């Protein structure tokens, strides 16, 4: 199961992801330091029976930025594909929504891309 | 069907002229964009997009969407709003949302 393990960006975020047999993603965001105070729960889903012709595996996950110590009143979802092999990747787009007043709700959601690799930069 | 004044659902007003060959020009601030000047006749909407640079808020919004004609004409869009930022903040420089434009307020 090539999804399971530690994934990084070139901003160097770190995510440890476990892919369960029938489609569950679980795990954590971990800080560069790796302590509990900057650790956040991740949960999501993936296609557990993708096409086996070299196509990617569709997936998504969410982190809400609250733990037992900090709360950034926000949550990010990542949507993308896992691609295996020697240069494995998870190629994603993300949406980061902050809790806002109704007057500011229109500007509550940031968007971007994230490329994850198994190799720590 | 595109040329005219359009209102989003939050106050905003978009005055646009659609040129024969695909140009969108007007004001929102100056607006400019492009549209499909020969859309399909298969019930499809008319693809379009435009940009407004907010000059100064040091930012610019692009709307991407389609015009749908008829008695309840609409321009249905999603938008990206990018701010000028430092490199450190570039990762968080773009907001996303949607706008529905109609011919009445």
């Amino acid at each position: 199961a090539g999804i399971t393990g530690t994934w990084y960006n070139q901003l160097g975020s770190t995510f440890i992801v476990t892919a369960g047999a029938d489609g569950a993603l679980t795990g954590t965001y971990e800080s560069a330091v790796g302590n509990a105070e900057s650790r956040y729960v991740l949960t999501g889903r993936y296609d557990s029976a993708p096409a086996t012709d070299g196509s990617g595996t569709a997936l998504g996950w969410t982190v809400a930025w609250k733990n037992n110590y900090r709360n950034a009143h926000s949550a990010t979802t990542w949507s993308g594909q896992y691609v295996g092999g020697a240069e494995a990747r998870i190629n994603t787009q993300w949406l980061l929504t902050s809790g806002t007043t109704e007057a500011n709700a229109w500007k509550s959601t940031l968007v971007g891309h994230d490329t994850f690799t198994k190799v720590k930069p | 069907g595109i040329t005219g004044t359009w209102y989003n659902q939050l106050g905003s007003t978009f005055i646009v002229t659609a040129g024969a060959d695909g140009a969108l020009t007007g004001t929102y601030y100056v607006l400019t964009g492009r549209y499909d000047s020969a859309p399909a006749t298969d019930g499809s909407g008319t693809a379009l997009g435009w940009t407004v640079a907010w000059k100064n808020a040091h930012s610019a919004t692009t709307w991407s969407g389609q015009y749908v004609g008829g008695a309840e004409a609409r321009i249905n869009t999603q938008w990206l709003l990018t701010s000028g930022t430092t490199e450190a903040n570039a990762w968080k420089s773009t907001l996303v949302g949607h706008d529905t434009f109609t011919k009445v307020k």
Binding site: S13, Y29, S31, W65, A72, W94, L96, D114 | A88, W91
Partner: peptide, 7 residues
């Protein structure tokens, strides 16, 4: 997302 910068 620059998570370290956001938090």
């Amino acid at each position: 997302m620059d998570v370290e910068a956001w938090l």
